[PDB]
Amino acid sequence: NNIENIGDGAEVVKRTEDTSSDKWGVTQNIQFDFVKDKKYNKDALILKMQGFINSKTTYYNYKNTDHIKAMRWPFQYNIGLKTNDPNVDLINYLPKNKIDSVNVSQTLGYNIGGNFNSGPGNGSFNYSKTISYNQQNYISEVEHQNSKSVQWGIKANSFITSLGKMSGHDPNLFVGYKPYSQNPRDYFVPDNELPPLVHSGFNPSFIATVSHEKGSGDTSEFEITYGRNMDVTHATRRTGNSYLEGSRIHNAFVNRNYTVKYEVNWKTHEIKVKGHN
């Protein structure tokens, strides 16, 4: 049913965990793929990190003013995986390098004997998992890594505005066309002109493989963190005719994260949520 035979003397035990937080506006859909291979000297678990991180983009009036209005938006999305267990090792993860393409689609391949690789286009190994996500206008890069952790940043990068090409740091990024409006939303460009990561949110698709030493302990725990770093753009009406000017508070609210702690059983191939925030 949920055990797939992959080669001669090898199989994959597939488990799934789903957890949403109205507190953080995050859904975490984790796939745990246990590699049971006679020709491989270690226990191996492939984690596919998916779900949704709501952009939580809000538009509000600045204080008791009628002419200064603000937009709070996600400058960067946070994706992280850590283990406390001393017997566990982070052996790979996808994406490995800084990547600016609109759609990030990569493939991790496995071959009997503990051989892991990356797919070209399509390849045929014993087992494989594919990552697939869109990051229009954003850039993906590894912020931190060691044998126990991996942290990705999906940050605002390059945008084609009316005033030409803009960086993610441009203070006029997202300033609108309606200075006389009384609605904070009107002070900023419409959804049609916004990237999905700003108007809606992020659908992560990340992979990490962990190796456990056989018989060093039945259970292991991993913490998976999904979040966002929020910027504040203040649009002020300048007065011939009237226009709007933007000013930025960069990293106004950092580490708005949803962290879930999962417990894994190497013998029974069972999953438990230990806790969360």
Residue numbers in the entry: 2 to 121, 125 to 243, 247 to 284
Paper passage:
With the exception of α-hemolysin, which is homo-heptameric, leukotoxins are bipartite toxins, formed by the non-covalent association of two distinct proteins, a class S and a class F component of approximately 31 and 34 kDa, respectively, into a likely octameric species. Panton-Valentine leukocidin (PVL) is associated with necrotizing skin infections, such as boils, and plays an important role in the poor prognosis of necrotizing pneumonia. Two additional structural domains are also found: the rim domain anchors the protein to the membrane surface, while the stem domain, closely apposed to the core β-sandwich in the soluble form, contributes two β-strands to the pore β-barrel. Since the binding of LukS-PV to the membrane is a saturable process, the necessary presence of a LukS-PV receptor on the cell surface was thus proposed. This was recently confirmed by Spaan et al. who showed that the C5a receptor is required for the binding of LukS-PV to human neutrophils.
The mutants exhibiting significantly decreased binding abilities with respect to wild-type LukS-PV were: R73A, Y184A, T244A, H245A, and Y250A, with Ki values ranging from 1.8 to 6.2 nM, i.e. a 69- to 238-fold increase compared to the Ki value of wild-type LukS-PV. Four LukS-PV mutants (R73A, Y184A, T244A, and Y250) displayed significant alterations for all measured parameters, i.e. at least 50-fold decrease in affinity for hPMN membranes, 2-fold decrease in the slope of Ca2+ influx and 2- to 10-fold reduction in pore-forming capacity. The T244A, Y246A and N248A mutated proteins crystallized in identical conditions (50% PEG 200, 0.1 M MES-NaOH, pH 7.50). The corresponding crystals belonged to the P43212 space group, with similar cell parameters (a = b∼94 Å and c∼308 Å) and 4 molecules per asymmetric unit. These crystals diffracted X-rays at medium resolution (2.50 to 2.80 Å). In the case of the rim domain, wild-type LukS-PV and mutants T244A, Y246A and N248A displayed only small differences, with r.m.s. deviations comprised between 0.20 Å and 0.30 Å, whereas the structure of the rim domain of the Y184A and Y250A mutants were markedly different, with r.m.s. deviations of 1.10 Å and 1.28 Å, respectively, when compared to the wild-type LukS-PV structure. Three of the four most sensitive residues (Y184, T244 and Y250) are found in this region, at close distance from each other. Indeed, three of the five most sensitive residues identified (T244, H245 and Y250) are located in this loop and form a surface that could represent the principal binding site for the receptor.
